[PDB]
């Protein structure tokens, strides 16, 4: 058998799960398991494709096998943490900077 | 753009996604495939900083 080369039609005895959009949960489309926010999509899509890779070879859009809709993939891991302190010899107050 | 092509390379493995190898191979047997991906990226990061 092949792995990630054609649209799904067999899979396993696993059941289904209600679609929860606008959340940074774990999704699973045609066996491919990822992590990101299932936001809306306003672009075009050919009526004979499934997955969609951009310039960075990343999973962008994917058609749902049940509702038949285009949903983008955007991970919520976007941010930085940096702490700035004036020193332990002056004051014990810190300032958490969110980049 | 050079670092983007390194993430898509397999470096002599079966794929380039860390969520794909673990979904098809067990951890006690997939340890030889993850080490090839980490070593292949350490040389790319060392060359990038150089």
């Amino acid at each position: 058998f092949e792995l990630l080369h054609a649209p799904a039609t067999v899979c396993g005895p696993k059941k289904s799960t209600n679609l929860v959009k606008n959340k940074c949960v774990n999704f699973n489309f045609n066996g491919l398991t990822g992590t990101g926010v299932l936001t809306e999509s306003n672009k075009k899509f050919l009526p004979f494709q499934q997955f969609g890779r951009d310039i960075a070879d990343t999973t962008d859009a994917v058609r749902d096998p049940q509702t038949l809709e285009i949903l983008d993939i955007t991970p919520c891991s976007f941010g930085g943490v940096s702490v700035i302190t004036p020193g332990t010899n002056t004051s014990n107050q810190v300032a958490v900077l969110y980049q | 753009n050079t670092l983007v092509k390194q993430l898509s390379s397999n470096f002599g493995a079966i794929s380039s996604v860390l969520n794909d190898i673990l979904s098809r191979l067990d951890p006690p047997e997939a340890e030889v495939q993850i080490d090839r991906l980490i070593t292949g990226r350490l040389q790319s990061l060392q060359t990038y900083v150089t």
């Binding site: 951009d54 960075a56 990343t58 991970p75 891991s77 976007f78 930085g80 980049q99 | 670092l3 983007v4 993430l7």
Partner: peptide
């Protein structure tokens, strides 16, 4: 509104990544 002149503003006319670890 800027602190530049007509010649300085002409120089500026001539001239997704963070999801992987490329921050500016």
């Amino acid at each position: 509104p800027s602190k530049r002149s007509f010649i300085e503003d002409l120089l500026f006319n001539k001239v997704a990544q963070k999801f992987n670890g490329l921050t500016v």
